[PDB]
Design a protein around this motif. Structure first.
Motif, PDB file in Angstrom:
ATOM      1  N   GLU A  17       0.276  -0.856  -0.266  1.00 54.28           N
ATOM      2  CA  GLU A  17       0.274   0.090  -0.265  1.00 54.28           C
ATOM      3  C   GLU A  17       0.717   0.895   0.181  1.00 54.28           C
ATOM      4  OE1 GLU A  17      -1.433   0.927   3.904  1.00 54.28           O
ATOM      5  OE2 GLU A  17      -3.627   2.168   2.709  1.00 54.28           O
ATOM      6  N   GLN A  18       0.898   2.075  -1.278  1.00 57.21           N
ATOM      7  CA  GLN A  18       1.371   3.240  -1.414  1.00 57.21           C
ATOM      8  C   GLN A  18       1.610   4.458   0.293  1.00 57.21           C
ATOM      9  OE1 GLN A  18       2.541   6.931  -1.395  1.00 57.21           O
ATOM     10  NE2 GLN A  18       0.749   7.214  -2.404  1.00 57.21           N
ATOM     11  N   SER A  19       0.136   4.645   0.309  1.00 53.56           N
ATOM     12  CA  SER A  19      -0.347   5.381   1.110  1.00 53.56           C
ATOM     13  C   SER A  19       0.286   4.590   3.267  1.00 53.56           C
ATOM     14  CB  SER A  19      -1.622   6.036   1.121  1.00 53.56           C
ATOM     15  OG  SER A  19      -2.518   5.605   2.478  1.00 53.56           O
ATOM     16  N   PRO A  20       0.175   5.973   3.721  1.00 55.54           N
ATOM     17  CA  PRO A  20       0.786   5.427   5.007  1.00 55.54           C
ATOM     18  C   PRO A  20      -0.444   4.698   5.905  1.00 55.54           C
ATOM     19  CG  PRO A  20       0.126   7.652   4.967  1.00 55.54           C
ATOM     20  CD  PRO A  20       0.007   6.839   3.882  1.00 55.54           C
ATOM     21  N   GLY A  21      -0.773   3.235   6.050  1.00 55.73           N
ATOM     22  CA  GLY A  21      -1.795   2.449   6.804  1.00 55.73           C
ATOM     23  C   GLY A  21      -1.713   3.114   8.495  1.00 55.73           C
ATOM     24  N   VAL A  22      -2.685   2.164   9.173  1.00 50.73           N
ATOM     25  CA  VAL A  22      -1.967   1.902  10.616  1.00 50.73           C
ATOM     26  C   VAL A  22      -1.023   2.994  10.587  1.00 50.73           C
ATOM     27  CG1 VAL A  22      -3.092   0.858  12.825  1.00 50.73           C
ATOM     28  CG2 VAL A  22      -4.127   0.052  10.745  1.00 50.73           C
ATOM     29  N   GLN A  23      -1.392   3.780  12.510  1.00 52.70           N
ATOM     30  CA  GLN A  23       0.365   4.470  12.426  1.00 52.70           C
ATOM     31  C   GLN A  23      -0.428   5.172  14.066  1.00 52.70           C
ATOM     32  OE1 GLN A  23       4.414   5.977  10.720  1.00 52.70           O
ATOM     33  NE2 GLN A  23       3.365   4.111  11.647  1.00 52.70           N
ATOM     34  N   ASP A  24      -0.739   5.024  14.741  1.00 52.44           N
ATOM     35  CA  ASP A  24      -0.649   5.422  16.356  1.00 52.44           C
ATOM     36  C   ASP A  24       0.313   6.031  16.849  1.00 52.44           C
ATOM     37  OD1 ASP A  24      -3.537   5.229  16.819  1.00 52.44           O
ATOM     38  OD2 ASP A  24      -3.240   3.770  18.556  1.00 52.44           O
ATOM     39  N   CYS A  25       0.008   6.327  18.348  1.00 50.54           N
ATOM     40  CA  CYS A  25       0.995   7.182  18.389  1.00 50.54           C
ATOM     41  C   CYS A  25       1.140   7.819  20.458  1.00 50.54           C
ATOM     42  CB  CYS A  25       1.286   9.086  18.172  1.00 50.54           C
ATOM     43  SG  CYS A  25       0.296   9.980  18.968  1.00 50.54           S
TER      44      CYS A  25
END
Length: 119
Positions: A17-25
């Motif tokens: 997947e080009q765009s970013p997927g899950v990425q919490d913080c």
């Protein structure tokens, strides 16, 4: 009634997947999480701490509310770089959730004693 797609997992590009997927913080060291992000860095799910089916382990947070991470909630009971938790999959004993130093731009920090630049 309702079920998420059950065919492909990366419905975006061929390779990945080009765009970013899950990425919490997280703020601090997974200590300021205050959220039940039961999602592991591999996209798995934080198995209930009190889950004695797949990976068994004593000293659970289900018996320790002092942490605030009961059930399948993902948290950092060690104050390490970030929170982590067992996975509902027997193929993944445990793992850190998708946490990171919330790189936000807003103020957020309510303290203004000293200021740090380029650091």
């Amino acid at each position: 009634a309702r079920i998420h797609h059950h065919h492909h997992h990366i419905e975006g590009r061929a390779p990945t997947e080009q765009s970013p997927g899950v990425q919490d913080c997280y703020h601090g060291d997974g200590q300021s999480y205050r959220g039940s992000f039961s999602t592991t860095v591999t996209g798995r799910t934080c198995q209930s701490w009190s889950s004695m089916t797949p990976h068994w382990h004593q000293r659970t947070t289900e018996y320790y509310p002092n942490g605030g991470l009961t059930r399948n909630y993902c948290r950092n009971p060690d104050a390490e770089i970030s929170p982590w938790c067992y996975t509902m999959d027997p193929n993944v004993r445990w793992e850190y959730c998708n946490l990171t130093q919330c790189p936000v731009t807003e103020s957020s920090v309510l303290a203004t004693s000293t200021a740090v630049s380029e650091q």
